Design an enzyme around this catalytic site. Structure first.
Site, PDB file in Angstrom:
ATOM      1  N   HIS A 130       0.583  -1.496  -0.472  1.00 52.49           N
ATOM      2  CA  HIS A 130       0.207   0.221   0.101  1.00 52.49           C
ATOM      3  C   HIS A 130       0.796   0.866  -0.092  1.00 52.49           C
ATOM      4  O   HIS A 130       0.529   2.164   0.207  1.00 52.49           O
ATOM      5  CB  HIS A 130      -0.722  -0.154   1.168  1.00 52.49           C
ATOM      6  CG  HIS A 130      -0.356  -0.111   2.624  1.00 52.49           C
ATOM      7  ND1 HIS A 130       0.466  -0.837   3.691  1.00 52.49           N
ATOM      8  CD2 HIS A 130       0.035   1.575   3.216  1.00 52.49           C
ATOM      9  CE1 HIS A 130       0.685  -0.698   4.898  1.00 52.49           C
ATOM     10  NE2 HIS A 130       0.648   1.156   4.508  1.00 52.49           N
ATOM     11  N   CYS A 155       4.911   0.976   9.209  1.00 53.78           N
ATOM     12  CA  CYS A 155       4.870   0.338   8.408  1.00 53.78           C
ATOM     13  C   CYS A 155       6.360  -0.003   7.875  1.00 53.78           C
ATOM     14  O   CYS A 155       7.392   0.741   7.075  1.00 53.78           O
ATOM     15  CB  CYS A 155       3.900   0.760   7.149  1.00 53.78           C
ATOM     16  SG  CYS A 155       2.477   0.992   7.599  1.00 53.78           S
ATOM     17  N   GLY A 166       4.529   6.101  10.019  1.00 52.03           N
ATOM     18  CA  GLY A 166       5.681   5.611   9.393  1.00 52.03           C
ATOM     19  C   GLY A 166       6.216   4.320  10.032  1.00 52.03           C
ATOM     20  O   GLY A 166       8.059   4.208   9.652  1.00 52.03           O
TER      21      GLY A 166
HETATM   22  C1  LIG Z   1       1.968   2.790   7.640  1.00 46.89           C
HETATM   23  O1  LIG Z   1       1.480   2.135   5.934  1.00 46.89           O
HETATM   24  C2  LIG Z   1       2.740   3.358   7.476  1.00 46.89           C
HETATM   25  N1  LIG Z   1       2.570   4.903   6.564  1.00 46.89           N
HETATM   26  O2  LIG Z   1       3.770   3.586   8.676  1.00 46.89           O
HETATM   27  C3  LIG Z   1       0.412   2.896   7.982  1.00 46.89           C
HETATM   28  C4  LIG Z   1       0.465   2.780   9.945  1.00 46.89           C
HETATM   29  C5  LIG Z   1      -0.296   3.941   9.603  1.00 46.89           C
HETATM   30  C6  LIG Z   1      -0.790   4.036  12.143  1.00 46.89           C
HETATM   31  C7  LIG Z   1      -1.603   5.378  11.667  1.00 46.89           C
HETATM   32  C8  LIG Z   1      -1.026   5.551   9.666  1.00 46.89           C
HETATM   33  N2  LIG Z   1      -0.536   2.018   7.405  1.00 46.89           N
HETATM   34  C9  LIG Z   1      -1.445   2.662   7.099  1.00 46.89           C
HETATM   35  O3  LIG Z   1      -2.305   3.475   6.991  1.00 46.89           O
HETATM   36  C10 LIG Z   1      -2.604   1.668   6.540  1.00 46.89           C
HETATM   37  C11 LIG Z   1      -3.007   0.951   5.863  1.00 46.89           C
HETATM   38  C12 LIG Z   1      -4.228   1.649   5.108  1.00 46.89           C
HETATM   39  C13 LIG Z   1      -5.295   2.301   6.374  1.00 46.89           C
HETATM   40  N3  LIG Z   1      -4.655   1.630   7.550  1.00 46.89           N
HETATM   41  C14 LIG Z   1      -3.774   2.130   9.420  1.00 46.89           C
HETATM   42  O4  LIG Z   1      -3.095   1.444   9.538  1.00 46.89           O
HETATM   43  C15 LIG Z   1      -5.638   2.569   9.027  1.00 46.89           C
HETATM   44  N4  LIG Z   1      -6.288   1.320  10.254  1.00 46.89           N
HETATM   45  C16 LIG Z   1      -7.747   0.609   9.582  1.00 46.89           C
HETATM   46  O5  LIG Z   1      -8.312   1.234   8.985  1.00 46.89           O
HETATM   47  N5  LIG Z   1      -7.635  -0.499  10.230  1.00 46.89           N
HETATM   48  C17 LIG Z   1      -9.289  -0.927  10.153  1.00 46.89           C
HETATM   49  C18 LIG Z   1      -9.293  -1.582   8.155  1.00 46.89           C
HETATM   50  C19 LIG Z   1     -10.279  -0.044  10.620  1.00 46.89           C
HETATM   51  C20 LIG Z   1      -8.791  -2.454  10.787  1.00 46.89           C
HETATM   52  C21 LIG Z   1      -5.478   3.870  10.220  1.00 46.89           C
HETATM   53  C22 LIG Z   1      -7.082   4.234  10.420  1.00 46.89           C
HETATM   54  C23 LIG Z   1      -4.123   3.534  11.532  1.00 46.89           C
HETATM   55  C24 LIG Z   1      -4.418   4.440   8.889  1.00 46.89           C
HETATM   56  C25 LIG Z   1      -4.333   0.358   5.309  1.00 46.89           C
HETATM   57  C26 LIG Z   1      -3.941  -0.130   3.060  1.00 46.89           C
HETATM   58  C27 LIG Z   1      -4.948  -0.635   6.008  1.00 46.89           C
END
Ligand SMILES: *[C@](O)(C(N)=O)[C@H](CC1CCC1)NC(=O)[C@@H]1[C@@H]2[C@H](CN1C(=O)[C@@H](NC(=O)NC(C)(C)C)C(C)(C)C)C2(C)C
Ligand SMILES: *[C@](O)(C(N)=O)[C@H](CC1CCC1)NC(=O)[C@@H]1[C@@H]2[C@H](CN1C(=O)[C@@H](NC(=O)NC(C)(C)C)C(C)(C)C)C2(C)C
Lengths: 301, 301
Positions: A41, A145, A143
Site C-alpha cells: 500500500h 509500516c 511511519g
Molecule cells: C503505514 O503504512 C505507515 N506509513 O506507517 C500505516 C501506519 C498507520 C498508523 C497510522 C498510519 N498503515 C496504514 O496507513 C494502513 C493502510 C491503510 C489504512 N491503514 C491503517 O493502519 C488504518 N487502520 C485501519 O483503517 N484499520 C481497519 C481497516 C479499520 C482495521 C489507520 C486508521 C490506523 C490509518 C491500509 C492499506 C490498511
C-alpha cells in the site's frame, strides 16, 4: 538470575532497513540481496486505501516512481513486482550487509523481536507474541509500516512479520515476508473484526517454570489434575486448550525443575480460581503468556 | 499506538563485544578504538575473589596472560592498566566498528538498554532502570560479566554500565565504564547489604501520561493535591519524594495531555490508596516505574 522480556540483538536486521517513498507515501523497506520488500500500500493515496485495486494501481506505476534510500545513498529501482500484499523492488545494488536469512510463517503463540523503524532508521527493539487471534500488541506509530519481526538461530535471521496496519483497539496486524496476512485481515481501509483473543496456555506454563528456575515457588501445590480436567478450567477462563504436544514440548523444563507438567497445570488452575492475592511472579501481577518454552530455555540457560 | 519496554537497537554495541580470558576465567570485554574494557576480577581465581588485593594480583600478570578473542580473530594485548574496578587492555588493532561513543555515569531512576553477552557473543537485549538503591534487575547468568548497558542519542552510544556481580536476592550490581561501582558495592566475595529499594515516583507519573496518550484514562479524577500533600502519601507507600524539578521535567507530557502534574499526582495517590481493583494500565496490573519521561516522549512520538 532474573527474567526479562528479552529481544534478539538487532544488528543484523538494522543493516537491512531502508526507506521507500512512492509519491507522498513514505515507509520502511527490507533490503536483502538486490530486492527491497515493503507493504504494497505504499503505492496508494489516502483515497486509494479506502477500496484499492492494487493491480490497477501498480500497473500505472513505473520504476522511477519508487524512491529507495539506504541511509544517505539512493538505490536505483530496476524492476518491481507484487507478491500477495508485499511489494518487491529489484535494485541495482546487492546489500553488502545481507545476513544469512530465511522467511518463515509462524504459528500463533510464537514470539519474535520487532525492530521498530521510521524513515528507514531503527528506533527500538522489543519482544512480541503472535496472538491466537493473529494480531500483535506492538508499539507502532505513523511511519512504522515495513518494520519487521524476526528470530535468530546461530547466524541466521528468520524474518516472520512485516507491519502493515493498526486495528481500532490499538493492536496491530501484518504479513509474513511473502505478503500473506496473519489472520483474516486485508490491506483495505474497511471495517474488519478481529477474533476474540485468548491466553496462550502453554506459554503461561513455561513462564511458571521460569519462575521456579529463578526461585519463585509460592504458587506450587501438591495437587495434580488430569489434562482433561485442566482444560475444563482453561475453557472457563478463556485459556487455549492444552494438548499432549504442548505437554511434550514442556518436557525439558519439567525435567529440569522436577515438577510434572500436570502438576504445574494444577498450580495454574488454582492461580486462575484464586488469583494471586497481592503477590507477584517474576515481577508481574498478571499471568504472563508471551514467553514460549524455547524463550525460557534460552534465557534461563 | 501501544506501549512496550523498548530497548535501543543493539548493532553499534554488538560490534564492540569481545571475549577476555585470563587463566581459567572467561568473561566479556568492550572493544573501543585500541582498548578493551572488562571487569578487573577476570585476573582472580575463585580463592582470590574471597578477599583480593588487585594491585598484588595484577602486578603478577603479564600481557601474554590476557587472551582476547574478537570473534574468530585473536587480539594481541600490548599493554594493561587498572582504572578503579575495570581493566583496560591495550590491543594492537583499533576496532574498525568503533561507534561514536561516550562514557556517562547515570543517576538512579535513569534507564538503559543491556546487551547480554556470553563468551563475547551477544545473546539478547532488554531495558533496565538504575534502582534507587543502585542495583539493577537484569537477566544475567554465569559468563555475562562485562556485558554493558547503554543509551543512544542520534549516532552516539553513551555507555553507562558494565556488569560485575549478582546479589543474594537475584539482583545485579556493576560499574560505570570508568570502573566506579554504582552503590556501596565492592568487587569482593563478602557479605554486602543493598539498601532498601524504593519506587521511582517521577517514572510512575511518566508512565501514567503514556497511558493517557494511548487512551488508558480510567484512573483519572477531578481531584488535585499539593506537592507537599502528595509526598506524605508517597512516603507511606515507599515512593521517592517528588521534587519541583521532577514536576518541571514532566512539563512536556502534562502539556500534551492537558493534565496538570499535580492532577496526575492526585490520581496516583488514589491508585496507591485504593489499588487498581482488577483493572490494568498499559497491560500491567502493577504501577510501572522503569520508564523515564524521556522514554515516554521517545516511544509515544
Ligand atoms: C503505514 O503504512 C505507515 N506509513 O506507517 C500505516 C501506519 C498507520 C498508523 C497510522 C498510519 N498503515 C496504514 O496507513 C494502513 C493502510 C491503510 C489504512 N491503514 C491503517 O493502519 C488504518 N487502520 C485501519 O483503517 N484499520 C481497519 C481497516 C479499520 C482495521 C489507520 C486508521 C490506523 C490509518 C491500509 C492499506 C490498511
Ligand atoms: C562474572 O565475573 C562472570 N564470569 O560472568 C560473574 C558472574 C556470576 C554469576 C555467577 C557467576 N561474577 C562474579 O563471579 C562475581 C565476582 C566475585 C563473586 N561474584 C559474584 O557475582 C558472586 N556474588 C556475590 O558473592 N555477591 C555478594 C558479594 C555476596 C554481594 C556469586 C556468588 C554470584 C558468584 C566478584 C569479584 C564479586
Amino acid at each position: 538470575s532474573g527474567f526479562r522480556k528479552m529481544a534478539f540483538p538487532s544488528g543484523k536486521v538494522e543493516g537491512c532497513m531502508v526507506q521507500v517513498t512512492c509519491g507522498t507515501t513514505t515507509l520502511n523497506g527490507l533490503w536483502l540481496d538486490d530486492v527491497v520488500y515493503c507493504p504494497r500500500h505504499v503505492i496508494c493515496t489516502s483515497e486509494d486505501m479506502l477500496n484499492p485495486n492494487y493491480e490497477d494501481l501498480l500497473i500505472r506505476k513505473s520504476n522511477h516512481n519508487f524512491l529507495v534510500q539506504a541511509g544517505n545513498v539512493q538505490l536505483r529501482v530496476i524492476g518491481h513486482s507484487m507478491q500477495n500484499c508485499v511489494l518487491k523492488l529489484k535494485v541495482d545494488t546487492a546489500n553488502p550487509k545481507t545476513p544469512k536469512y530465511k522467511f518463515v510463517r509462524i504459528q500463533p503463540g510464537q514470539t519474535f523481536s520487532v525492530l521498530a523503524c521510521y524513515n528507514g532508521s531503527p528506533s527500538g527493539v522489543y519482544q512480541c507474541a503472535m496472538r491466537p487471534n493473529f494480531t500483535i500488541k506492538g508499539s507502532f506509530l505513523n511511519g512504522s509500516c515495513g518494520s519487521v519481526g524476526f528470530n535468530i538461530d546461530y547466524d541466521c535471521v528468520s524474518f516472520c512479520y512485516m507491519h502493515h496496519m493498526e486495528l481500532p483497539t490499538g493492536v496491530h496486524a501484518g504479513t509474513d515476508l511473502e505478503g500473506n496476512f496473519y489472520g483474516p485481515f486485508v490491506d483495505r481501509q474497511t471495517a474488519q473484526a478481529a477474533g476474540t483473543d485468548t491466553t496462550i496456555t502453554v506459554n503461561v506454563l513455561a513462564w511458571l517454570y521460569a519462575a521456579v528456575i529463578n526461585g519463585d515457588r509460592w504458587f506450587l501445590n501438591r495437587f495434580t489434575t488430569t489434562l482433561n480436567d485442566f482444560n475444563l478450567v482453561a475453557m472457563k477462563y478463556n485459556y487455549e486448550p492444552l494438548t499432549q504436544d504442548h505437554v511434550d514440548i514442556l518436557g525439558p523444563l519439567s525435567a529440569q525443575t522436577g515438577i510434572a507438567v500436570l502438576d504445574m497445570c494444577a498450580s495454574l488452575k488454582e492461580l486462575l480460581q484464586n488469583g494471586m492475592n497481592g503477590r507477584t511472579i517474576l515481577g508481574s501481577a498478571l499471568l504472563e503468556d508471551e514467553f514460549t518454552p524455547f524463550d525460557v530455555v534460552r534465557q534461563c540457560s
